[PDB]
Design an enzyme around this catalytic site. Structure first.
Site, PDB file in Angstrom:
ATOM      1  N   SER C 267       0.811  -1.208   0.000  1.00 17.37           N
ATOM      2  CA  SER C 267       0.000   0.000   0.000  1.00 17.37           C
ATOM      3  C   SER C 267       0.846   1.261   0.000  1.00 17.37           C
ATOM      4  O   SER C 267       0.728   2.090  -0.905  1.00 17.37           O
ATOM      5  CB  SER C 267      -0.934   0.007   1.207  1.00 17.37           C
ATOM      6  OG  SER C 267      -1.689   1.202   1.251  1.00 17.37           O
ATOM      7  N   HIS C 295      -4.947  -5.730  -1.932  1.00 18.37           N
ATOM      8  CA  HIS C 295      -4.971  -4.569  -2.813  1.00 18.37           C
ATOM      9  C   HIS C 295      -5.062  -4.946  -4.283  1.00 18.37           C
ATOM     10  O   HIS C 295      -5.534  -4.143  -5.091  1.00 18.37           O
ATOM     11  CB  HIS C 295      -3.724  -3.716  -2.583  1.00 18.37           C
ATOM     12  CG  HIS C 295      -3.837  -2.787  -1.419  1.00 18.37           C
ATOM     13  ND1 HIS C 295      -4.631  -1.662  -1.440  1.00 18.37           N
ATOM     14  CD2 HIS C 295      -3.261  -2.818  -0.195  1.00 18.37           C
ATOM     15  CE1 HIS C 295      -4.537  -1.038  -0.280  1.00 18.37           C
ATOM     16  NE2 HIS C 295      -3.713  -1.721   0.494  1.00 18.37           N
ATOM     17  N   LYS C 327     -11.487  -3.566  -0.004  1.00 16.32           N
ATOM     18  CA  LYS C 327     -10.887  -2.585  -0.896  1.00 16.32           C
ATOM     19  C   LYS C 327     -11.683  -2.430  -2.186  1.00 16.32           C
ATOM     20  O   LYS C 327     -12.182  -1.342  -2.482  1.00 16.32           O
ATOM     21  CB  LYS C 327      -9.441  -2.975  -1.207  1.00 16.32           C
ATOM     22  CG  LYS C 327      -8.625  -3.384   0.011  1.00 16.32           C
ATOM     23  CD  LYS C 327      -8.567  -2.267   1.027  1.00 16.32           C
ATOM     24  CE  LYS C 327      -7.455  -2.471   2.042  1.00 16.32           C
ATOM     25  NZ  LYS C 327      -7.389  -3.841   2.604  1.00 16.32           N
TER      26      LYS C 327
END
Ligand SMILES: CCCCCCCC/C=C\CCCCCCCC(=O)O[C@@H](COC(=O)CCCCCCCCCCCCCCC)COP(=O)([O-])OCC[N+](C)(C)C
Lengths: 153, 62, 492, 464, 44
Positions: C267, C295, C327
């Site tokens: 991230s 992610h 996410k």
């Protein structure tokens, strides 16, 4: 910020002395301190040099061998709540470029401040006492040992 | 134009010296210490150091 | 490891003068923090902090004061950047409640007015599924009316439902693995399933930048943990060789297992893991692979199948595939995918399987609807345009920011864009000036990161139109001129 | 000796410094404890590659037997509620922790639907980064007012609540006196922190006193260390494994006598005990301020996903910046928070439902007494209690099989029961196998009598 | 150079002996290539 948001290391402190530009900043800090001390009008140059040596050594002793722990909460559950910064450095690896630099610099400063004080004895005793007070804890033998139980807790 | 430039340069000084986040009286303490050091350094330079830099500054101004 | 596509990434090093000025700022802050602590120690200045009750003054002090040093002296000064309440769906535009403080951020009070139409660069909705009005919301409402909100028992007991089985089958089809299981928290997935796989006497090779959930899961189990450098294949290979050769530390016995923990997209850094190298070394040295795809499960890939689709690898190579629906899919949850024996053993011997409540019924319906939309089972071209739009937005934003003279970390195909500020005061300055221009960003400071590296992360989305990106870029350029944030030697 | 001193003073300096360095050398040799052989051997590259090729790793998952009962999951074809459908058979729910029956309350569904239309399903971020909604602050304030405390903090997962609250305050080198029969959540919380764990007998203040006195002696041994060591007592208001309440007044007195803070777990007692359902503190009348930290979850009584911790601001404000499940995870979805707020409103409106639950627990506990092959474990005030085997066989597998056979027979008789599940290898103190019985304000008296008769007949038939 | 040599010749002998042993210590530090881990482990 929280420890561990952008790096997995439990103790960031251990690496603060290996960062890019810390050595040059330390040397420039010593230089700026010397310039400020020279700035005083009524103080002679040998006194300026011995003041520089004593002040730098006292500050280094306070920051590296007196303050113990971390300034931020660490997620290894207080493993280093008793260790000082010198013992925390590099996770206890005893010889490293940072530790070599930190041990060498006071000796070079001692040579310079000894020469610029024309080898006066009154200055010599103070400079040698201060240099020894800095250099004694740097020894690997005095790792995690407290004399007469001062600064244990 | 000049006043805006001076304001911007003060802003950059604040950002660089991390005085931006400090309370106003802490800024006052830091500024007073800095100006005292600079003034005393210039006084000592005038008294003891030869005024060769003074001639260079005058030539640059001229 | 063979790359079927170019693998471009740039981590430019900090300018030297910028590092020196950073250390100047941190030294000033440290000295004034010591001064403030001394002033508060002798009660010369009144402290705005809560104190232990009078009955308990005899008790040993609960906290150590030095641990809170950076909380009182540095974090409080710029606390207004973080914990910003919102009152709307976190779409491209979010509404932020406004607050003011007259005690220098020690206490906050809410003004009546709310800021409206703030461009949202902090939220995680990569594919833009965070919509209060859509088909997914209709399905979630339909299930909420009947099933109710929340289940009141564990999976092994009556708490198991049919919705969870349907979601598990859907996830197994989506990833391409034999079977999968779903948990009610992404953090809980790691923290309660890593200890089950690996116990004492095994080795857990962990990356240098893993999430806190992976680190906590490794720490809970008794395994030995070694850390290799971030995407440094030489370091991973060296640790694997030494671990296999020299055996356990105290008693030179072979390890029972070797487990490698890696993530899809990191991230804060923005980099993508070198998957082919990791898979090649894993096959060569007979280790096992744990791939955290929080992610990359929606953002990456031509169809959003993950990072393995992005690299073209085979999903059967990675042993354990963890993922999170928070996410991309817009609903809170987590999952683990793998072979059938793995899933059976986890269904039997997992902490959250036995002791913790399963997912909510409306949330699993939202996940099912969103995942069906991405699959194409709906039949509408929507859900395939989202991936193309996200790729175009990432390319445009990264290129335009790089050509202004900024420093940007990470790969060229990663939606998360870190922009480097390098100084402590510039963190608060950037946050406040960006909010003043109606853009919401996330700024990250020292104790989280290395000392020289303080950043601001932008999370792009497929909900972002081109006009929003142009407005954001113009404002970012103006603020960069204002604060002098262009530290790039190559371009300016 | 004076002549020797005078001669030494008359000696040159270099001689004396050389003798000093010689004495230092002598000290170094006399303190050279390590003995060295000057023998160094390095492995050959071929041997290293042979070791690499020889090593074979264990399989990731051990082969699982096909006879494991937990492998078979009960499939509910509908919402888990009164008159549910388990395994395709209609049954009355005696197994799900829904005491107040707020899962199907239409007001809760309406509030959740309104908040779902307003906000959506996902929050998309931690509490720090644009993940804080106004509903979260409203719920925190509602909890703080309801529990008569200054501040409260909400987590998005019940396990994480205590598993992240405990390590935040307890660090390495501290002392924790935790009950023996404490749930797995507390055990994992205590494992995450590295403090020293002292275990005392279930509801024995004699053992607590003994351990506290031993620690007092050890403190008398070393005052300096005892100055920087903190002591905590972690207990549960209404135990999960045993179903027995805890004696607070003695715990509070021992706290004020021995300087050790108290952490209370109130997962089961939060909405069932006390006149207004404020937990075990109200049931005993003990002041709310005596207990440092009170944890609970919103899943059992409030029928929504999450958890919370409440207390004074001094203790609570630390978790916002030190709790792992709080700092590094997404926030609670808005609809669940709205459902929790509506459930709190319903609880505050009419407080007689606690009395209804109390009387129904009394009725079922009285009726169940008299089984030949099963013994009731718990207390009359508990909503969930255990039925354990009166005569235990040699092995645990047969006990589990007998209990499962009874459970299946009851399920075919329209009563839905579940058996308590544990991780056999991990649990510190592993409770005996038992059938879990849960009482709800939804179940009427007649259903309670019928359930008692059914389990009674089935136990008599199976055990004989 | 020459001035430094004269100034050193004007220094006391014990001072120069101390400086020499300090230089030897610096050389030992520079050439102490081995990085001892400084750890102790005992079998259970
Ligand atoms: C061990 C303590 C180490 C203290 C180091 C002091 C460094 C800070 C310093 O010299 O100046 C600080 C005094 O600082 C104080 O006077 C604070 C003295 C300790 C307070 C501890 C609480 C203030 O420095 P300044 O002029 O505000 O810049």
């Amino acid at each position: 910020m929280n420890v561990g948001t952008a790096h997995s290391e439990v103790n960031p402190n251990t690496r603060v002395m290996n960062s890019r530009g810390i050595w040059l900043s330390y040397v420039l800090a010593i230089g700026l301190l010397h310039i400020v001390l020279l700035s005083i009008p009524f103080v002679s140059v040998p006194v300026v040099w011995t003041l520089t040596n004593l002040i730098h050594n006292m500050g280094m002793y306070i920051f590296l061998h007196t303050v113990k722990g971390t300034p931020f909460e660490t997620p290894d559950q207080g493993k280093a709540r008793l260790l000082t910064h010198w013992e925390q450095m590099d996770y206890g690896v005893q010889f490293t470029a940072s530790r070599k630099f930190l041990t060498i610099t006071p000796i070079v400063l001692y040579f310079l401040t000894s020469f610029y004080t024309k080898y006066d004895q009154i200055h010599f005793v103070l400079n040698t006492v201060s240099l020894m007070s800095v250099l004694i804890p740097k020894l690997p033998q005095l790792h995690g040992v407290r004399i007469f139980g001062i600064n244990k807790y | 134009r000049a006043w805006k430039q001076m304001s911007w340069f003060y802003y950059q000084y604040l950002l660089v010296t991390a005085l931006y986040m400090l309370e106003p009286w802490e800024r006052t303490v830091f500024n007073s210490m800095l100006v005292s050091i600079v003034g005393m350094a210039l006084y000592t330079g005038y008294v003891f150091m030869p005024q060769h830099i003074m001639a260079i500054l005058h030539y640059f101004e001229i | 490891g063979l790359y079927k596509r170019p693998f471009n990434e740039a981590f430019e090093e900090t300018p030297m003068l910028v590092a020196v000025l950073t250390y100047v700022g941190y030294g000033v802050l440290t000295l004034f923090g010591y001064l403030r602590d001394f002033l508060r120690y002798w009660r010369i200045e009144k402290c705005h902090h809560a104190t232990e009750r009078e009955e308990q003054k005899d008790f040993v002090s609960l906290y150590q004061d030095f641990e809170n040093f950076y909380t009182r002296n540095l974090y409080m000064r710029i606390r207004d950047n973080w914990n910003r309440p919102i009152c709307s769906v976190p779409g491209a535009r979010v509404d932020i409640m406004e607050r003011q403080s007259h005690d220098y951020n020690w206490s906050f009070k809410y003004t009546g007015n709310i800021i409206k139409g703030v461009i949202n660069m902090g939220s995680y909705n990569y594919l833009g599924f965070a919509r209060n009005t859509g088909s997914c919301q209709e399905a979630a409402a339909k299930v909420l009316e009947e099933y109710g909100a929340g289940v009141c028992s564990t999976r092994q007991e009556i708490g198991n439902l049919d919705k969870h089985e349907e979601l598990e089958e859907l996830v197994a089809r989506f990833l391409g693995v034999e079977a999968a299981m779903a948990y009610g928290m992404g953090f809980a997935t790691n923290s309660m399933n890593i200890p089950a796989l690996v116990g004492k006497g095994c080795l857990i090779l962990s990356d240098e930048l893993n999430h806190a959930s992976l680190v906590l899961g490794a720490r809970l189990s008794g395994a030995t943990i070694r850390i290799f450098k971030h995407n440094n294949m030489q370091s991973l290979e060296k640790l694997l060789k030494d671990a296999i050769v020299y055996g356990q530390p105290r008693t030179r016995r072979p390890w029972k297992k070797i487990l490698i923990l890696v993530e899809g997209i990191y991230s804060m850094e923005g980099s993508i893991v070198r998957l082919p190298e990791v898979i090649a070394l894993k096959k060569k040295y007979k280790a096992y692979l744990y791939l955290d795809e929080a992610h990359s499960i929606g953002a990456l890939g031509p169809t959003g199948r993950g990072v393995v689709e992005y690299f073209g690898l085979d999903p059967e190579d990675v042993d354990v595939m963890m993922g999170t629906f928070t996410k991309s899919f817009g609903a809170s949850g987590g999952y683990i995918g793998g072979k059938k024996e793995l899933i059976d053993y986890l269904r039997t011997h997992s902490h959250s399987a036995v002791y913790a409540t399963s997912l909510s019924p409306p949330v699993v319906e939202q996940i099912i609807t969103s995942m069906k939309c991405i699959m194409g089972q709906d039949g509408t071209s929507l859900g395939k345009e989202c991936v193309q739009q996200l790729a175009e937005n990432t390319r445009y934003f990264r290129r335009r920011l790089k050509e202004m003279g900024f420093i940007i970390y990470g790969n060229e195909d990663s939606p998360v864009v870190p922009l480097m500020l390098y100084m402590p005061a510039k963190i608060g300055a950037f946050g406040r000036e960006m909010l003043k221009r109606n853009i919401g960003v996330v700024v990250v400071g020292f104790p989280a990161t290395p000392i020289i590296e303080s950043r601001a992360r932008f999370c792009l989305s497929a909900a972002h139109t081109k006009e929003i990106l142009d407005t954001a870029l113009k404002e970012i350029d103006e603020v960069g001129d204002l604060l002098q944030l262009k530290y790039s030697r190559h371009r300016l | 000796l004076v002549e020797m001193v005078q001669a030494l003073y008359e000696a040159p300096a270099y001689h004396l410094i050389l003798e000093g360095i010689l004495i230092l050398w002598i000290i170094r040799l006399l303190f050279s404890k390590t003995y060295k052989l000057q023998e160094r051997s390095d492995l050959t590259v071929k041997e290293k590659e042979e070791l690499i090729e020889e090593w074979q790793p264990e399989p990731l998952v051990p082969p699982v037997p096909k006879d494991h009962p937990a492998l078979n999951y009960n499939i509910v074809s509908g919402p888990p509620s009164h008159k549910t459908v388990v395994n395709g058979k209609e049954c009355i729910n005696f197994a799900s922790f829904n005491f107040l029956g707020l899962l199907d309350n239409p007001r809760v569904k309406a509030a959740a639907l309104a908040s779902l239309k307003k906000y959506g399903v996902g929050t998309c971020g931690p509490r720090g980064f644009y993940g804080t909604f106004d509903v979260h602050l409203d719920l925190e304030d509602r909890l703080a007012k309801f529990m008569k405390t200054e501040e409260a903090i909400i987590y998005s997962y019940g396990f994480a609540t205590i598993a992240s609250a405990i390590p935040a305050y307890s660090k390495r080198g501290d002392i924790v006196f935790v009950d023996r029969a404490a749930c797995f959540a507390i055990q994992k919380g205590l494992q995450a922190s590295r403090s020293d764990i002292k275990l005392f007998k279930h509801n024995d203040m004699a053992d607590l006193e003994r351990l506290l006195k031993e620690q007092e002696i050890e403190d008398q041994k070393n005052p300096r260390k005892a100055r920087v060591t903190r002591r905590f007592i972690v207990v549960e208001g209404l135990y999960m494994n045993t179903g027995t309440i805890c004696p607070l007044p003695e715990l509070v007195k021992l706290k004020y006598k021995y300087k050790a803070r108290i952490f209370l777990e109130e997962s089961l007692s939060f909405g069932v005990l006390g006149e207004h359902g404020r937990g075990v503190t109200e049931h005993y009348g003990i002041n709310i301020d005596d207990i440092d930290l009170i944890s609970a979850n919103m899943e059992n009584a409030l029928a929504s996903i999450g958890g919370f911790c409440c207390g004074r601001s001094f203790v609570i404000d630390h978790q916002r910046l030190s709790g792992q499940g709080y700092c590094f995870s997404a926030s609670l979805p808005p609809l669940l928070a709205a459902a929790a707020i509506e459930a709190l409103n319903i609880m505050e409106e009419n407080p007689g439902i606690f009395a209804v639950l109390k009387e129904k627990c009394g009725q079922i506990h009285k009726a169940l007494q008299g089984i030949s092959g099963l013994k009731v474990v718990g207390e009359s005030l508990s909503p969930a209690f255990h039925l354990q085997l009166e005569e235990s066989t040699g092995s645990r597998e047969q006990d589990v099989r007998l209990l499962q056979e009874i459970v299946d027979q009851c399920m075919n008789r329209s009563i839905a029961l579940t058996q308590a599940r544990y991780l056999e290898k991990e649990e510190k103190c592993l409770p005996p196998p038992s059938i879990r019985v849960v009482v709800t304000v939804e179940q009427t008296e007649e259903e309670l009598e019928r359930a008692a008769s059914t389990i009674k007949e089935v136990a008599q038939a199976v055990l004989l």
